[PDB]
């Protein structure tokens, strides 16, 4: 996207979102990142929404095919699951490459740095979901380390009701439960996160209250499923 203006890439990412063209949206936001400038709050959200949708479709397809493949145990189902898996890994690697070159190193504010590090944990978590071989353990540790660094910053620099802090804790708790085989850590994190946010709600405006309680309900839904 080197010949298109940064502002035009951003404009077209917003159009692609409205058109539910998430692959285009991701390519436009990839082009915007590669312009080399830091991203605003809104632009970070566009980048995140685009790739979450793209990899979300790939994960859903991979799960369908992995399920069929396990019920079967010709080479077609395995071959096609492998194809989808490779395409998913390529998208995760692309996002991780954007964070590494050079979004994270240039992110100094807590809101941007926690946002990108949560992203890094998420896309390593997606890699871990399909990993088996010699690097599954290393991929899991890469996810844990990104989430942990993001947690440490958010606890120091953000209020307990901050939606990024809450969504980070939500996804790290899912990491603990689904990836790290640590359901007690998952439940403890979600419950402490929920309780500390509840006690901070009195400080918020009506609109911030709606934003925070929405994500607290997601924590509560998980706790209900897990206990």
């Amino acid at each position: 996207m080197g010949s298109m203006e940064r502002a035009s890439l951003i404009q077209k990412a917003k159009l692609a979102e409205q058109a539910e063209r998430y692959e285009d949206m991701a390519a436009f936001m990839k082009g915007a990142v590669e312009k080399g400038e830091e991203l605003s709050c809104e632009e970070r959200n566009l980048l995140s929404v685009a790739y979450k949708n793209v990899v979300g479709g790939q994960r859903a397809a991979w799960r369908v095919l992995s399920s069929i493949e396990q019920k079967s145990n010709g080479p077609e189902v395995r071959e096609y699951r492998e194809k989808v898996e490779t395409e998913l890994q390529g998208v995760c690697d692309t996002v991780l490459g954007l964070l590494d070159s050079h979004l994270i190193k240039e992110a100094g504010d807590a809101e941007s740095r926690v946002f990108y590090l949560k992203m890094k944990g998420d896309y390593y978590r997606y890699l871990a979901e399909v990993a088996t071989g010699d690097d599954k353990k290393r991929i899991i540790d890469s996810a844990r380390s990104a989430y942990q660094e993001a947690m440490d910053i958010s606890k120091k620099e953000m209020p307990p009701t901050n939606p990024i802090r809450l969504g980070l804790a939500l996804n790290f708790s899912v990491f603990h439960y689904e990836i790290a085989n640590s359901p007690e850590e998952a439940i403890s994190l979600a419950k402490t996160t929920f309780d500390e946010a509840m006690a901070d709600l009195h400080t918020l405006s009506e609109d911030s209250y709606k934003d925070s309680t929405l994500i607290m309900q997601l924590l509560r839904d998980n706790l209900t499923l897990w206990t």
Binding site: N45, L46, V49, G167, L170, N171, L218, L225
Partner: peptide
């Protein structure tokens, strides 16, 4: 177990 649905913004 639901992660953040960051599918719309």
């Amino acid at each position: 177990a639901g992660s953040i649905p960051g599918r719309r913004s």
